[PDB]
Amino acid sequence: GIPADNLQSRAKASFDTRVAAAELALNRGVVPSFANGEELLYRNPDPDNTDPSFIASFTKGLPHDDNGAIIDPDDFLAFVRAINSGDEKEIADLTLGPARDPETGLPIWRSDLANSLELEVRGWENSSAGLTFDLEGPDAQSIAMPPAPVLTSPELVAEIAELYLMALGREIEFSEFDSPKNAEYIQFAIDQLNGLEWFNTPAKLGDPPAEIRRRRGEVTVGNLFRGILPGSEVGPYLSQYIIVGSKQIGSATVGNKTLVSPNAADEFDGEIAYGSITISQRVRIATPGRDFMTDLKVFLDVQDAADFRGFESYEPGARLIRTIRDLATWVHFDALYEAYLNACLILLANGVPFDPNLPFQQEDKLDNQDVFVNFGSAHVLSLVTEVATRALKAVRYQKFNIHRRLRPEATGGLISVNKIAAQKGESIFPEVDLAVEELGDILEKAEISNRKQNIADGDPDPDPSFLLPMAFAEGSPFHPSYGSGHAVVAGACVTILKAFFDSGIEIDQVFEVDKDEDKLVKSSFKGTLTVAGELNKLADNIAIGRNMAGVHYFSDQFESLLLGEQVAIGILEEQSLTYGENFFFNLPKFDGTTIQI
Amino acid sequence: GIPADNLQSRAKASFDTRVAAAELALNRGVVPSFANGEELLYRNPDPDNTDPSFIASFTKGLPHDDNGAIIDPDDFLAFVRAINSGDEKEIADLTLGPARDPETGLPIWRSDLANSLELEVRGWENSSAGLTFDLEGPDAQSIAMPPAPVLTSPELVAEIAELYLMALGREIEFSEFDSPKNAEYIQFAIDQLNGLEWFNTPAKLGDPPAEIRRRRGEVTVGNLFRGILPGSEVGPYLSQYIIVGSKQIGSATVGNKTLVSPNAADEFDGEIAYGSITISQRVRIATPGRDFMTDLKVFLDVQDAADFRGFESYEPGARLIRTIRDLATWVHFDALYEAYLNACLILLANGVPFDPNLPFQQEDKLDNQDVFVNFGSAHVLSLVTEVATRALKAVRYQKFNIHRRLRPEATGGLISVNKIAAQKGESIFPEVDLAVEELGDILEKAEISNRKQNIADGDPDPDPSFLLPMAFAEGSPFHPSYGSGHAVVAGACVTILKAFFDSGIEIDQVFEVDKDEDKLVKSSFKGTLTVAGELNKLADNIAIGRNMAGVHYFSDQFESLLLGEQVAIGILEEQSLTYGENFFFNLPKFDGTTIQI
Amino acid sequence: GIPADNLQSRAKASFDTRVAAAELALNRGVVPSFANGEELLYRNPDPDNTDPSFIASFTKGLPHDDNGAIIDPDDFLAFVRAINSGDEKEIADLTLGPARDPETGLPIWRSDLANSLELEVRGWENSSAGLTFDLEGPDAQSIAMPPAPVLTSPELVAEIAELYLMALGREIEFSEFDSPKNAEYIQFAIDQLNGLEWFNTPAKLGDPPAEIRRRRGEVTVGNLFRGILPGSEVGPYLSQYIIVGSKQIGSATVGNKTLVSPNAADEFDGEIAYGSITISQRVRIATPGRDFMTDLKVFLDVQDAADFRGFESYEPGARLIRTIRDLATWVHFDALYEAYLNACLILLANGVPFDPNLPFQQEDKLDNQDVFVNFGSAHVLSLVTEVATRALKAVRYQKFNIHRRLRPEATGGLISVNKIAAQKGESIFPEVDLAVEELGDILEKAEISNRKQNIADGDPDPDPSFLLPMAFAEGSPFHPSYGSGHAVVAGACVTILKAFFDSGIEIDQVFEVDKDEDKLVKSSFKGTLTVAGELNKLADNIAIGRNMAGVHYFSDQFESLLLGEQVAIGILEEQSLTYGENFFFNLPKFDGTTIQI
Amino acid sequence: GIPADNLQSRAKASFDTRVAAAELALNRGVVPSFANGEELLYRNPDPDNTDPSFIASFTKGLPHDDNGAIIDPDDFLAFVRAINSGDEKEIADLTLGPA
Amino acid sequence: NTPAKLGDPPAEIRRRRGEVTVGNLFRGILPGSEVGPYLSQYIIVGSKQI
Ligand SMILES: [Ca+2]
Ligand SMILES: [Ca+2]
Ligand SMILES: [Ca+2]
Ligand SMILES: [Cl-]
Ligand SMILES: [Cl-]
Ligand SMILES: [Cl-]
């Protein structure tokens, strides 16, 4: 008899399809995640004491001493148990914030400011989201990020140096990186980073492969404060998709006739056609030169959960992203998929073709089929947004269940406390001795900057402070540094977009923001940009924006981007079982190879 | 021994969780979908001929005769086979468009306009997306929409009357429905609809339950052209969420201190804070009074696949939705989830609380836990968008595999052809005799309107035409009328938003668009609106926008809303197996009851 | 990844719970049941004959000869096949009752009385209920009762002696066991039983363990006619729960105030508060001194199925159980769970605490939770009643499918026939020679008693008769002797009650029935009774009541009590899988150990 | 050969009978229960307040104000969570009665 | 005093009551409840006796 398949009911075929995708995900196997060894390494220096200090772990929210070290190690150990359990009662039983007044229940802050504002505590954001399952994509716990840099490492000294340079450079305009007025600061930054072993010496055979891949070499004005995704280092700093608007309604080709929108110029003035309404690319303007958490008492209050969220001031109006601070403001409040949805809307409005390995992409006189629900605009619009939460569950697992890495502000706190103590011949937080020893010039500029801030904030003669100035009044979100929610979603979202569009398409005209006015100008770049390159650059812009704000390190961002890419790839693979058509997505990966799914 | 559960590996628990969700969906069972009987009822009037005419089926794209009937019944029968197979080759083998010129290869159109533009054909949009499976939610084919109204029915006569009144009312401003200058037309509309049995007589015992649920009673200015979801018929016609902006960055409460955004007024001028950038509620302005497909030859060309997409003209600028035509323009190009994403961004910017039955919604001093990835803003932002494509697969099944209902333009074409023939004592399309008999007054106004359009379009002495004027040059999308992509997505997305937010929260200040200027004014409405009511009203606005454009009937939209609600509910139910927390979504459904999931 | 459990649908969790309980019951394994070997041992004495006689088997209903032996061995063999099949046709095909008159179909009885009453036959009661499955608890056939005593054994001689002593003692008042007027009879009973090997010699090493456990030693006035459950032999003969009433509605503590029912005295006058109505403990009064089946022809008619049910006479009114006969009347008609439901209502009305290892039993200011549905009154009220039918299926299996032991009346029949024949130098039923030889004094008293009865019943000069006088006109129910429906339900029901209540609670005031009036008097008992002890005593009272009626032997009752306890324990164990709470039942068993379930 | 059934042990037949009853109950399928919409409809009339009032819900035992409305909406929300969890500790943590 | 209307929930239609009379006042709607005396025989009568 002739070999055959058999039909079954639609309902069984649907069930079996979903089981087959679960089976595909199971059959990928799982990998463990390794932490960097710091959490039980560093010990309380107190002679009669057998506790870890937890100084290199995220402990924002647990009560800290005057040096920024947690007072009671049980508070961190309890937090770790609650992270692994997820039980709401156990979470509500944790200690959060500083000692409260017995009679009134008020938290007593260190700073006059926090007490005068009557601040309450804020709590951890989804400390057990890494336990949540998902109906699609790699399970949160199936994949890994590699160990984070340790405080004593050349990589960390380079990372924190870079963050102080970004902080002190917040008022520099992207379009003026190479301008004479900025030469002194830009060259100082370049030379300082080039003076560090991470950047000036290559990895050596036998180093961890993750280090080899993410290690950077010579700093130049062309790569200063940029990411390393392919495409990020070519052409202007900002992705086209974060400054240009799009083709507008009314511009169209109808057979042999070209119509021109009466609003066509809006494309070049930062308006994205968003259906029949618009999105403006112009960002709100945080007050220039105002940074936060430059005073130790206010800093410690923030470390003790004081809720400063919403305290920033702004200038009137909005402009195309102009300064480093403006990129920090952009990433303070974005929906995590916002940048990529906006890019997707630009690509759609501009008529950029879909990946030509999808079905039905020919002229309809040939294929009799146009695309929308599947393989067209509605499809990509859902898929680019849906991956974000799947990527976030995986990065929460790394953040809280695995690595619990301290945020940059906390590292700056260690550096400041150490240096102040060393000036009195005392050793506090010797773990950051190398950073203190090597970043003297950068720290002196931060001291001066901090003094000015602390005077402006109303302290006429402040104690010296070497804290990392924060762009945001509350500093980092209430969750660990490694990885990053922004960067994991960036990695997942631009993966979907590069796969779904023809992302080899070249950009026709390249723009930058004008040096003198709030407008676009034609770039002088001579070279070719592609859609994939500008999507990678967008991911790097959002991710590095967090670093420019003071809330992530380079390694957090790069490793998160890779994690997000894995999540998106797994979702595409599982979803491939649901379609009858013969097609695939061509995806150029961050590593320069292409996977066909 | 004490009864117990056992642990297993995380990977097996993830696999078993996905299988258990698939099992929950399979255990719901499936229901058949019934079509209204027309497809094989209406017969080619040719005496020597044993074929159906397919005149009440969607046949846009297949070659039609001078009366708008398909020329070869095999063309439709092959299209039905291609819809149920999905095979790309079989789709590419279909006949699409009319005979082509040997020398140029171009389609030979009927109209001078189409020929002068050298239009090509456009093809069906995802005619087999109803075959696609999904990793989550009810399978596309597991659920049903009820049979559509038949051409001979009181319901259809009422539906098509309403669509002509909307078309002829396209220049009326929402703000001025009750103004003296509009009283003659508004009263004509109300009186005409009240003269129809559907609206002036109740359903009778024994009628189909779906008819009983969707049947409308007495028309008034307060309900004219509105939907029937709860909340839609109270307060102003447009949902707050399609005209108001939101709170802006810089407005906040930090303990006992209030900060005010320097651009706080933008909230009342239609700007949604979209991260740190903005969305403008102002819609592009299609040329007032210009309608399309009012000439029979142009109409037939469109029925024969002529690609008029992109042909509209616009005035400069943008304004808050002002006229009926502006709501048609809004729905011409929206991403399908756009309205609901925008509402969600408003609710988030305004600080509207989440559903209090979610976990962690208390002050953090009580629960030690804030929300983002799960149970907070990132969660809803992905969930509201991801349901769209699942809802679209189900509605594509109903559109193409089940009901294949002709779009309103095609019904208007039958009416026009019938009436013109009857004036010459011939009977063509007796199926629409009742609509012709009953809508004389409306059709006379359409004739006058169509003559003016046809003169403007360059025909100095046009033949009489009773066609339904289209807001869009191409008329309907290239897919069947029943149900609607917009409406099914609206149903799924507002279901998610009502469940995820505390949607009992009351609206503080109610706005409308000013009668005289492009700005918001405080409404005189004196009752109470809720977030759930205004989300339902938003769904109805987008759904009826399609009707006002000429491309759906009332029944298409209402039954699609219900289908979308079922898709979203199923997704929530299946996803409930992935969380460890003790919580549920409270969902007020379209029927007035609440489900807790 | 962290090891985890996964959720599944409620419906699957319910299914899996029920399967897990079936699996628990399966995994207990099963045990065989062994009969005592008599059924094929005793042979028809007729020289040319190769049939068993079946004289030690229950054959009530099959036609018997003049000596009480079945006429046709096929009738018993057919009955056994019908028992094991359960098929209704096969049961209806059996031979039941004596030969019928060919012309009228009437059964022709031996006795003038049965013929004058025109009695018809009664049939076997659920002869195949031991085939029935159950949704909960040990399957009927999974557990066993040990072989019954054989007719030739010292245990049986002791058993039947005791039953004749009870019969001849039916008018003795419990409260007067130790009274001078009864000394002669009471001492005769004590001395006669002490003259038998069963009671006066201990078991020997190597005897069956079941014999060792149920063997009794020295008879005393304190243990005469009592059971051997722990608690039965301490204090007054009758359980408090069969004579005392309860606290009444209106007696309550409300905060610091005590209210006293206007009906409080009813507690001491035998009224149980039964919700807002009452149960009276006072029993109907069967005519003193009237016994049944003392005439051989009437006896044989009863053995031949004559339906004498309902023939007893009563005196007016009702009284607290006073005499041995009154306990026999109590157990003639009780619902099988009645005694224990009544005890449960007493305990509830009196506020006896539930088992403190159940949840929510603390003051509600501590636990915020009171009990009713689960772990409270409604729970125990259903559970104590539901176990009865499960216990009855198991005892039916033993009764009919396994042991088929003759009822005491039939043994008395063998004894009478044997002794009458021996007086004429003939040997009939030599199997009961030992009982005849050893119980001469008891049999002479029965002869005299029987003569008086037979004279009163209208025979002026009766033949001598040594039959066991029956309390009930119909003698035993229509099913075998081993085990007992009453006793198996007693064992199951008091198991539930001891587990569910705090059954270590001590009784405050102990009562007995007054020697002179129908009322309670304070007992002279100096000692402590507990709830568990009085529940065991109640079980023994109901079980021995059947023996006092003439319808069971000691071994029937004790072994049935153990079987019932097993059934209840198995139900509790299986049900333990259905609850989420952390709790268990502490159960003091009949053997003096405690199981925690 | 003549089609037939086969016997099995009594213990397996009892097990299979209990499974078949569980299977009959599972094969009935399940239906959702819908509430009347009031719980999140009625709102605390306090203008500066974004809470439901729960006035049409059973709140006997939670502390009420002088009008019979619960004082703290978290008390009812916690009672709802305790109802759906069943956990004894969570139940014991609820607020029951007044100061 | 008004009947349910077409379109009302089926559960309302089933349980809705009409005109109140002395014969139905404070009674239920199960079949049998509205015929004969208000109290069931089973809550007032005793039984045949032993
Ligand atoms: Ca195509
Ligand atoms: Ca919270
Ligand atoms: Ca309690
Ligand atoms: Cl099916
Ligand atoms: Cl696989
Ligand atoms: Cl995040």
Ligand SMILES: [Cl-]
């Ligand atoms: Cl890969």
Ligand SMILES: [Cl-]
């Ligand atoms: Cl695993």
Ligand SMILES: [Cl-]
């Ligand atoms: Cl299920």
Ligand SMILES: [Cl-]
């Ligand atoms: Cl669609």
Ligand SMILES: [Cl-]
């Ligand atoms: Cl539902």
Ligand SMILES: [Cl-]
């Ligand atoms: Cl279920």
Ligand SMILES: [Cl-]
């Ligand atoms: Cl087991």
Ligand SMILES: [Cl-]
């Ligand atoms: Cl029985």
Ligand SMILES: [Cl-]
């Ligand atoms: Cl046991």
Ligand SMILES: [Cl-]
């Ligand atoms: Cl077995």
Ligand SMILES: [Cl-]
């Ligand atoms: Cl079944």
Ligand code: NA
């Ligand atoms: Na767009």
Ligand code: NA
């Ligand atoms: Na590409």
Ligand code: NA
């Ligand atoms: Na709600």
Ligand code: NA
């Ligand atoms: Na009681």
Ligand code: NA
């Ligand atoms: Na006890």
